[PDB]
Design a protein around this ligand. Structure first.
Ligand code: CLA
Ligand code: CLA
Ligand code: CLA
Ligand code: CLA
Ligand code: CLA
Ligand SMILES: CCCCCCCCCCCCCCCCCC(=O)OC[C@H](CO[C@@H]1O[C@H](CO)[C@H](O)[C@H](O)[C@H]1O)OC(=O)CCCCCCCCCCCCCCCCC
Ligand SMILES: CCCCCCCCCCCCCCCCCC(=O)OC[C@H](CO[C@@H]1O[C@H](CO)[C@H](O)[C@H](O)[C@H]1O)OC(=O)CCCCCCCCCCCCCCCCC
Ligand SMILES: CCCCCCCCCCCCCCCC(=O)OC[C@H](COP(=O)(O)OC[C@@H](O)CO)OC(=O)CCCCCCCCCCCCCCC
Ligand SMILES: CCCCCCCCCCCCCCCC(=O)OC[C@H](COP(=O)(O)OC[C@@H](O)CO)OC(=O)CCCCCCCCCCCCCCC
Ligand SMILES: CC1=C(/C=C/C(C)=C/C=C/C(C)=C/C=C/C=C(C)/C=C/C=C(C)/C=C/C2=C(C)CCCC2(C)C)C(C)(C)CCC1
Ligand SMILES: CC1=C(/C=C/C(C)=C/C=C/C(C)=C/C=C/C=C(C)/C=C/C=C(C)/C=C/C2=C(C)CCCC2(C)C)C(C)(C)CCC1
Ligand SMILES: CCCCCCCS[C@@H]1O[C@H](CO)[C@@H](O)[C@H](O)[C@H]1O
Ligand SMILES: [Ca+2]
Ligand SMILES: [Ca+2]
Ligand SMILES: [Cl-]
Ligand SMILES: [Cl-]
Ligand SMILES: [Fe+2]
Ligand SMILES: [Mg+2]
Lengths: 38, 81, 32, 30, 57, 503, 341, 37, 39, 65, 172
């Protein structure tokens, strides 16, 4: 079924996804608050 | 100007030194204790001076197996009594 | 609770640096 | 023939020094 | 004879060198720091054997 | 006037002449293939696929012809060493001739498109200006590529309508062109499974067709069209160069590590097969199987195929060459004639000794013999005065099993030493060094030369990518920055968002 | 309007530390490469991979600390923390050399990030992207030396390790095994680097010594104004001087500065090509004519054969400790040595 | 035949010729040892 | 009080620099004692 | 400019220069595909690297007999 | 020696006998020529990148500058702006005189120290020696990269001028 290396692959995949997702959620949030007035 | 307040205004400010006369010695002392209590050794797997060789052994514990390298290292550590 | 990009940039470097310097200081007194 | 080649190339380089210095396009102020 | 041990080293193109291996070879270790102009030699042949060109250059 | 490094930019708004120039480039490449093939056929010796295969002979396009099913000459031989084969028209000679003719025709078409550059087709119906609808061109060409990819997978590689591809056993002993079924399980992504090559071309072909239809039928988003400058053909040059250096790094990789598409009988073995003593291990396995089956040593070692033994020799390791050591491997160590047989070294007490092998890193290596446990038992000393392990002291002898020296034993130290010296290179062979005036210095194989050329070209093409991407995205300023570049855009404090003049 | 546009606005503000889209890649990867190196050199050993101490914690100094390559047995393993070798164990991960691929890869993506930053800021400020283009050379050098070169060899082990003395070892290894000094690509590299330094020096000095007197101070730095239209030094006087001293001189300022880009960038690129050759041991190691002659003729000697003897010394005396995985045992009697030494 | 409007004159000034020749001759002086080998 | 200027920058510089000297000096002492000393 | 038989036939294929879909169009979908592609490349890379190791997948010359 | 391979010979033997790679003056020399190269490319590319537009697409940008012209040929404010945003505002030189002085000073001082390196190693004050500097609790030597460097240096030492030494120490 799922080998340990495949499990690990999923763990890496998800770790990276969480990192990018958090980064962009934070960046988008900040940019929403801190709007460039024109 | 970039918008933020000049650094020379900050590092000459009393508030700054009130904050940092606490935070800097704290961080320093913390790293100090990270070493002096031996935690660093156990976090990074770094041999103490008495831990490079078993008493009569004289061969480096070189990792030779890629996929059970973890196990091999654990074995080498067990062989230190 | 207001941070800035400059504050963050400064501290992600400064905080570990002080910590590490304390560590290395301590290391100077280790004996074999 | 190797020696002749090395020396030939060198000689050409010296010649080039001569032309690049004494037969350069003159700089002119506008 | 760069190292003064009668073991002459070839530096020039005509004596088996290319651009990368060629060299004018330093004067002999038997000379040391002694001043060795052409006129200190008994002959040009001597002068050449001992690395006089290096000193002149 | 134009600087010399820009002369070809006159093609940028001339689609007809661009096509002419591309035609000429294609003619030149096709012609090079034809000529290269002819040169190789004029120099290739087909008489010994065992100890003188193509990869020993500095052959470069011959293996690519063989990989996809062209294995025979009109002259009657084949690279698998068969006789009286009829390859049909698609011999190596036929392929060559085909490429020459193709080249000629491309040259003519080039002339025609150069002269008749001003075709209605290249004009925009509205503005009458030269115009290439690049997104739709990308669709059309992608679709074509997909049909051809799919067709290559489903017909040629499968043998459904075509010859298949080169396959072999894990030790490169019995290679041949065979039809290959697609592999649709995870092993399709095993680089060493040919099935996966077939499945790849089928699936990626289908995907190519579908994405092609998409790129034909769906216009680019305004935002992407703007951002990537899709009106500017140089954007296509930038991204195409990127894709190509990606591809070049991939083929360098699979040439150096090996895959189903870089077989060792066409390109020679890998450096890694030597690092891990792959062939030596298989050889010892066969020998031990023979001994356990009741064979004698002479019989067990004589049962080892010369081809296998030849793989276990460092002169065939592609990581033993030199950048300016030119030509075929045969020009170095010689044209391999025969396996001499396996050398077994023994000391005066009858202990079998093993010569320490040369690693690829070393141009030269000492001669050191150990027992099975790796204890030093003999060597060739540099300084003699305090020598303990000399062959003369230790009474080292050498006996041969298999090959030309089978059953022979040598006891005189010079000869024993000579064979030991050879033993650091693995299995020992007799070479003809007079025919090519061989100089005795190892040269790399086409596996090496291919890897080199393509790694270097990939790396240079990275610069190409950077350069043309820059020229695309900075078109407005590449003759200099605006004469009146306001001191509020380049200075601080004036603007909130950089570049944005309206903040 | 639209989160994308809002976000773009924010990323591209003219703050003290420009972020940009490029910063999303640059800052974490750069920070992790640097932090990785400091962490490793301060706390981490190379006992299990090299048989070496390599951290302040073990007693190394600034010159001798390093983050070392993984063991040869790891091959070209990506050695990810969650991969098959470390299996998520941070400590074993350090012990197995994980920090080396950590730093090499976060470093590569960081370099990508930086060059992307150069493009983004060029585009936002309105200047031509030549700085980025020039940064292609550091890229070529890093990618060829730290990635391609070990990828061609047996494993990451033979990659350069990240430290001062370690790098020095890398130099000496390349001399002993590759005869790298003989390689015309390295030579072009050297010419680009030293020629670059030369141009830097000579240009700087020339401008500083053909300055117009634009103030009364004996310290001449104050007599310059950023928004001034006038050249601050005389190109005409500089040109006459160098024409009379050296025979030739720049006369075009634009050509001068482009050339200053061109020389070291081209040098580094050539050296990268040579190293790519070395990945495959495709060396400029010998001159075959030299060897044929020397083999036949025991009185024929040149600096080339002398240097080969030095190399042979290097390989024999350094290989057992430098390549521990080979388990080399070289008895005293086989070590090459000249008289007495 | 209508003349092609995309044509452009080409230039190489004398200084460029000297630089180019220098580049070629010095490259040759460098690589020739390796060509003879 | 975030007042910028309350502590004279020359005193700050002097103190900070002396600190740097002290810490580096400790490291150099460390080169002769304990680990790394060769003794 | 010159018309030809084949030029006439091909004309519609080179007639929509500059034509675009409004706004972001199918950029989201594209983003998805690019993501999937990145993941695919990561997979085959890790399989070739022996970082990802699968049952019945022997990344060796000893793959098939 | 006055030749290419001879220069390499000189370097290798120098390393054997003086460990020059571990000498801080040679290290400063390297910082000087690496740094010189870097700053060369940096200055070159920045000035190039802020040339004022004076030409068309079909001519060399260089014709945009005329020898002897009084006006500067590039936008130093633009160049400065770029470089300050690339790092931070204050690592950048807005003053061309200070900039050019730095361009002169960095490699000149670095190379001065390189010269002093060779000229002091002339009197055998050699690079740092950390051979067997790290010892474990028993007394076993724990090698560092310094010790590997030592092994290479030993190779060079024992092989150089193979017929010239009769006595165990190479005292010159
Ligand atoms: C299920 C059906 C199927 C099957 C069985 C295959 C099978 C395969 N695919 Mg295919 N593929 C398919 C469908 C399929 N494909 C579809 C539908 C698409 C979309 C069109 C593709 C698109 C695709 C691409 C783009 C590639 C493959 C490749 C392959 C081969 C992978 C093994 C290998 O040698 O990788 C070797 C290649 C890698 C491990 C990828 C390396 C990724 C690099 C590291 C990214 C970074 C590159 C960049 C330049 C940085 C380099 C820096 C460096 C110098 C340090 C294998 C034959 C690969 C191939 O052709 O190999 C010859 C490949 O590159 N396929
Ligand atoms: C007209 C049809 C045709 C046919 C049947 C052949 C057949 C052959 N050619 Mg010839 N050739 C042709 C046209 C043809 N050629 C043309 C037009 C040129 C000039 C450009 C050449 C120039 C040429 C050279 C220089 C060489 C050959 C060689 C060969 C032989 C080896 C083939 C090989 O390994 O390719 C391998 C093909 C590939 C690896 C294809 C790469 C595909 C890339 C990755 C596509 C990427 C872009 C694409 C859009 C990606 C998306 C697709 C989508 C599905 C996802 C084979 C006999 C070789 C030979 O043996 O010479 C004697 C050789 O060295 N040919
Ligand atoms: C993809 C490229 C490629 C590769 C990998 C091969 C591979 C091979 N060729 Mg083939 N060949 C090719 C293209 C290629 N060829 C082309 C284009 C031609 C027509 C010229 C040939 C014509 C040809 C002939 C006639 C022969 C070969 C032979 C061979 C074999 C030996 C190669 C050798 O000795 O290289 C040696 C490589 C070098 C010495 C390296 C050259 C490096 C250059 C000179 C560096 C230039 C640097 C540059 C000037 C610097 C600029 C600096 C500036 C930017 C500042 C090998 C299998 C030989 C063989 O054995 O056939 C049976 C053989 O006789 N080839
Ligand atoms: C698909 C590949 C490709 C194509 C079609 C182009 C096309 C172009 N390039 Mg680009 N470029 C590429 C890849 C490519 N490039 C790569 C890989 C690099 C890094 C090496 C570059 C680096 C580059 C620079 C720095 C410049 C260009 C420029 C140009 C434009 C003018 C070219 C010219 O007139 O040169 C004319 C060239 C000559 C008259 C002689 C060149 C002789 C070369 C150096 C050696 C001989 C090579 C040999 C003939 C062919 C071997 C081919 C094979 C090995 C690949 C043109 C659009 C120029 C531009 O932008 O103009 C506005 C420009 O300045 N290119
Ligand atoms: C953007 C910044 C960035 C980048 C480019 C990297 C890159 C890397 N990191 Mg680093 N790292 C970072 C930030 C970053 N990191 C941060 C902030 C931390 C602290 C949390 C770390 C801590 C860290 C550690 C401890 C390690 C790494 C490692 C790595 C390497 C392996 C990563 C991997 O395999 O991910 C795999 C996962 C992904 C790439 C996620 C992809 C998500 C995809 C795109 C989503 C797809 C969605 C799909 C399209 C939707 C379709 C819908 C459909 C199904 C219906 C790689 C070079 C490893 C390493 O260096 O080993 C030596 C390692 O051990 N990183
Ligand atoms: C086209 C221009 C028209 C004129 C040609 C100009 C020639 C200039 C010199 C180039 C010659 C280079 C080879 C010289 C040595 C030689 O004699 O070769 C000689 C070799 C052939 O080798 C010969 O083979 C013979 C048997 O057939 C014998 O064994 C001979 O002894 C042996 O010399 O020629 C080649 O192999 C040519 C193909 C080389 C392909 C190398 C691929 C990798 C190159 C990548 C380089 C990238 C560089 C990027 C830099 C930026
Ligand atoms: C805003 C704040 C930003 C802070 C900066 C954060 C990133 C920069 C990090 C720079 C790291 C530079 C190396 C530190 C060396 C160190 O810690 O020594 C720590 C060592 C500790 O000393 C050693 O400790 C051991 C303890 O077991 C043993 O006792 C050893 O015998 C002993 O030598 O000190 C030395 O080696 C001597 C001082 C050498 C200092 C480095 C010289 C400067 C060279 C740096 C050049 C490049 C970097 C420039 C950056 C500016
Ligand atoms: C060379 C490097 C040192 C130069 C020191 C300054 C010269 C000395 C000089 O002339 O000016 C001194 C300058 C003083 O700054 P001020 O107080 O005048 O700042 C006022 C501004 O905030 C008003 O706009 O010092 C610094 O800015 C140090 C910043 C260190 C770095 C802080 C952030 C670090 C983050 C890492 C880098 C981020 C950017 C790169 C991204 C990849
Ligand atoms: C004083 C220290 C001497 C070594 C450094 C000297 C700097 C100048 C040497 C480079 C000359 C390049 C060719 C001439 C280039 C040239 O023509 O320069 C000209 C430049 C400007 O000249 P001015 O005429 O405006 O000023 C010089 C005099 O006229 C006095 O006003 O000279 C200076 O700025 C001198 C500043 C020295 C002030 C002390 C410098 C301290 C440097 C510390 C370095 C320590 C490094 C330790 C290792 C990390
Ligand atoms: C017209 C015509 C014809 C004919 C054709 C022909 C005859 C063709 C030929 C063709 C050819 C016969 C071609 C060739 C080509 C070649 C080439 C194109 C080459 C190139 C090369 C190169 C590019 C190289 C480079 C290099 C060098 C030199 C050195 C080393 C490195 C390298 C590689 C870089 C026919 C009858 C069919 C029909 C139709 C009409
Ligand atoms: C790896 C890793 C990671 C990361 C980490 C980090 C990020 C860290 C950082 C770190 C850091 C960030 C550190 C720092 C340090 C610092 C130091 C240690 C410094 C020192 C200094 C000194 C010593 C100085 C010196 C000098 C100079 C340089 C010049 C002037 C003079 C003097 C002498 C003062 C994570 C978790 C993600 C995951 C796992 C892995
Ligand atoms: C990653 C790039 C994806 C752009 S996605 C794009 O973004 C807009 C917000 O700015 C939305 O209004 C729009 O509907 C959406 O398709
Ligand atoms: Ca004790
Ligand atoms: Ca002969
Ligand atoms: Cl010597
Ligand atoms: Cl003596
Ligand atoms: Fe300047
Ligand atoms: Mg200490």
């Amino acid at each position: 079924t799922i080998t340990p290396s495949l499990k690990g692959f999923f763990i890496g995949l998800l770790s990276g996804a969480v990192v990018l997702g958090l980064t962009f959620a934070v960046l988008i949030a900040i940019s929403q608050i801190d709007k460039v007035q024109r | 100007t970039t918008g933020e307040r000049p650094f020379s205004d900050i590092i000459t400010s009393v508030r700054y030194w009130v904050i940092h006369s606490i935070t800097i010695p704290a961080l320093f002392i913390a790293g100090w204790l990270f070493v002096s209590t031996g935690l660093a050794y156990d976090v990074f797997g770094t041999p103490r001076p008495d831990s490079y060789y078993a008493q009569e052994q004289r061969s480096i514990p070189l990792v030779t197996d890629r996929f059970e390298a973890k196990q091999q290292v654990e074995t080498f550590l067990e062989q230190l009594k | 609770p207001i941070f800035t990009v400059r504050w963050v940039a400064v501290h992600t470097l400064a905080v570990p640096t002080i910590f590490f310097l304390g560590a290395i200081a301590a290391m100077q007194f280790i004996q074999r | 023939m190797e020696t002749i080649t090395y020396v030939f190339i060198f000689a050409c380089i010296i010649a080039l020094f001569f032309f690049a210095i004494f037969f350069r396009e003159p700089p002119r102020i506008t | 004879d760069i190292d003064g041990i009668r073991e002459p080293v070839s530096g020039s193109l005509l004596y088996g060198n290319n651009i990368i291996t060629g060299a004018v070879v330093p004067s002999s270790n038997a000379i040391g720091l002694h001043f060795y102009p052409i006129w200190e030699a008994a002959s040009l042949d001597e002068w050449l054997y001992n690395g006089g060109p290096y000193q002149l250059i | 006037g134009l600087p010399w490094y820009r002369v070809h930019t006159v093609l940028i708004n001339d689609p007809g002449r661009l096509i002419a120039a591309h035609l000429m480039h294609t003619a030149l490449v096709a012609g090079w293939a034809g000529s290269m093939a002819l040169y190789e056929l004029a120099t290739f010796d087909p008489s010994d696929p065992v100890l003188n295969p193509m990869w020993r002979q500095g052959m470069f396009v011959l293996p690519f012809m063989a990989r996809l099913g062209v294995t025979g000459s009109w002259s009657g031989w084949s690279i698998t060493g068969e006789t009286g084969i009829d390859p049909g028209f698609w011999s190596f000679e036929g392929v060559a001739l085909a490429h020459i003719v193709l080249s000629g025709l491309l040259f003519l078409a080039a002339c025609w498109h150069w002269v008749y550059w001003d075709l209605e087709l290249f004009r925009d119906p509205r503005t009458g200006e030269p115009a290439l609808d690049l997104p739709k061109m990308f669709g059309i060409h992608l679709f074509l590529a997909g049909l051809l990819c799919f067709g290559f997978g489903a017909f040629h590689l499968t043998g459904l309508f075509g010859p298949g591809m080169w396959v072999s056993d894990p030790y490169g002993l019995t290679g041949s062109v065979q039809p290959v079924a697609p592999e649709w399980g995870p092993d399709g992504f095993n680089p060493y499974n040919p099935g996966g090559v077939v499945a790849h071309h089928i699936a990626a072909g289908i995907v190519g067709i579908i994405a092609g239809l998409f790129h034909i039928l769906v216009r680019p988003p305004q935002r992407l069209y703007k951002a990537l400058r899709m009106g500017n053909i140089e954007t296509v040059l930038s991204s195409s160069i990127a894709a190509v250096f990606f591809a070049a790094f991939v083929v360098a990789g699979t040439m150096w590590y090996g895959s189903a598409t870089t077989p060792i009988e066409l390109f020679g073995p890998t450096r890694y097969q030597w690092d891990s003593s792959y062939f030596q291990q298989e050889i010892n396995r066969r020998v031990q199987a023979s001994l356990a089956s009741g064979a004698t040593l002479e019989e067990a070692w004589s049962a080892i195929p010369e081809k296998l033994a030849f793989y276990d020799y460092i002169g065939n390791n592609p990581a033993k060459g030199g950048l300016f050591r030119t030509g075929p491997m045969n020009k170095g160590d010689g044209i391999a004639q025969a396996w001499k047989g396996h050398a077994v070294f023994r000391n005066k007490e009858g202990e079998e000794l093993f010569v320490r092998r040369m690693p690829a890193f070393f141009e030269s290596f000492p001669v050191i013999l150990t027992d099975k446990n790796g204890v030093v038992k003999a060597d060739i000393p540099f300084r003699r005065a305090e020598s303990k392990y000399s062959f003369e002291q230790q009474g080292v002898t050498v006996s041969f099993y298999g090959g030309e020296l089978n059953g022979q034993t040598f006891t005189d130290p010079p000869t024993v030493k000579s064979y030991a010296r050879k033993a650091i290179f693995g299995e020992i062979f007799e070479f003809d060094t007079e025919t090519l005036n061989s100089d005795g210095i190892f040269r790399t194989s086409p596996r090496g030369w291919f890897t080199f050329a393509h790694a270097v070209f990939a790396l240079l093409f990275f610069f190409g990518h950077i350069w043309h991407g820059a020229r695309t995205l900075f078109r407005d300023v590449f003759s200099g920055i605006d004469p009146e570049l306001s001191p509020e855009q380049v200075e601080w404090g004036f603007y909130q968002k950089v570049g944005d003049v309206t903040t | 309007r639209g989160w994308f546009d809002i976000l773009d606005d924010w990323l591209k503000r003219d703050r003290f530390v420009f972020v940009g889209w490029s910063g999303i890649l640059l800052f974490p990867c750069a920070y992790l490469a640097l932090g990785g190196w400091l962490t490793g050199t301060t706390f981490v050993t190379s006992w299990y991979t090299h048989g070496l101490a390599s951290s302040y914690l073990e007693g190394c100094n600034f010159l001798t600390v390093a983050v070392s390559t993984p063991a040869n047995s790891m091959g070209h393993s990506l050695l990810l923390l969650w991969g098959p070798e470390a299996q998520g164990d941070f400590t074993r991960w350090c012990q197995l050399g994980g920090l080396w691929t950590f730093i090499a890869l976060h470093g590569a993506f960081g370099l990508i990030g930086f060059m992307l930053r150069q493009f983004e800021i060029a585009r936002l400020v309105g200047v031509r992207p030549y700085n980025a283009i020039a940064f292609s050379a550091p890229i070529a050098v890093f990618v060829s030396v730290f990635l391609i070169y070990p990828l061609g060899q047996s494993s990451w082990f033979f990659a350069p390790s990240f430290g001062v003395a370690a790098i020095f070892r890398f130099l000496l290894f390349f001399q002993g095994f590759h005869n790298w000094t003989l390689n015309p690509f390295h030579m072009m590299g050297v010419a680009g680097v030293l020629g670059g330094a030369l141009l830097c020096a000579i240009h700087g000095a020339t401008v500083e010594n053909t300055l117009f007197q634009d103030g009364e101070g004996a310290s001449t730095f104050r007599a310059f104004n950023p928004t001034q239209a006038e050249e601050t030094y005389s190109m005409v006087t500089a040109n006459r001087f160098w024409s009379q001293i050296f025979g030739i001189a720049f006369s075009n300022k634009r050509w001068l500065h482009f050339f200053m880009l061109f020389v070291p960038v081209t040098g580094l690129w050539m050296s990268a090509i040579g190293v790519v050759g070395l990945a495959l041991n495709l060396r400029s190691y010998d001159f075959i004519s030299q060897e044929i002659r020397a083999a036949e003729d025991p009185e024929f000697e040149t600096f080339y054969t002398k240097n080969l003897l030095l190399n042979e010394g290097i390989r024999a005396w350094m290989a057992p400790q430098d390549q521990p995985h080979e388990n080399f045992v070289f008895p005293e009697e086989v070590l090459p040595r000249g008289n007495a030494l | 035949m209508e003349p092609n409007p995309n044509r452009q004159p080409v230039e190489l000034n004398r200084t460029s010729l000297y630089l180019g020749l220098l580049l070629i001759l010095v490259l040759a002086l460098l690589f020739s040892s390796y060509f003879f080998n | 009080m975030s007042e910028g200027g309350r502590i004279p920058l020359w005193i700050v510089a002097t103190v900070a620099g002396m600190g740097v000297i002290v810490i580096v000096g400790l490291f150099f002492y460390g080169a002769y004692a304990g680990l790394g000393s060769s003794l | 400019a010159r018309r030809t038989w084949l030029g006439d036939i091909l004309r519609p294929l080179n007639s929509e220069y500059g034509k675009v879909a409004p706004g972001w169009g199918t950029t989201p979908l594209m983003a998805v595909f690019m993501g999937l592609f990145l993941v695919f490349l990561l997979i085959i890379l890790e399989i070739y690297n022996s970082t990802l190791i699968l049952d019945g997948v022997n990344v060796s010359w000893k793959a098939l007999g | 020696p006055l030749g290419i391979s001879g220069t390499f010979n000189f370097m290798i033997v120098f390393q054997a006998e003086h460990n020059i790679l571990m000498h801080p003056f040679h290290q400063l020399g390297v910082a000087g020529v690496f740094g010189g190269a870097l700053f060369c490319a940096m200055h070159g590319s920045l000035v190039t990148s802020s040339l004022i537009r004076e030409t068309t697409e079909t001519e060399s940008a260089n014709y945009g500058y005329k020898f002897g012209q009084e006006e500067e040929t590039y936008n130093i404010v633009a160049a400065h702006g770029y470089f300050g945003r690339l790092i931070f505002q204050y690592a950048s030189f807005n003053n061309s005189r200070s900039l050019h002085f730095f361009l002169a000073a960095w490699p000149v001082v670095g190379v001065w120290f390189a010269a002093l390196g060779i000229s002091t190693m002339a009197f055998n004050l050699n690079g740092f020696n950390f051979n067997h500097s790290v010892i474990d609790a028993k007394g076993n030597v724990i090698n560092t990269w310094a010790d590997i460097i030592n092994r290479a240096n030993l190779g060079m030492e024992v092989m150089h001028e193979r017929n010239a030494h009769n006595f165990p120490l190479d005292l010159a």
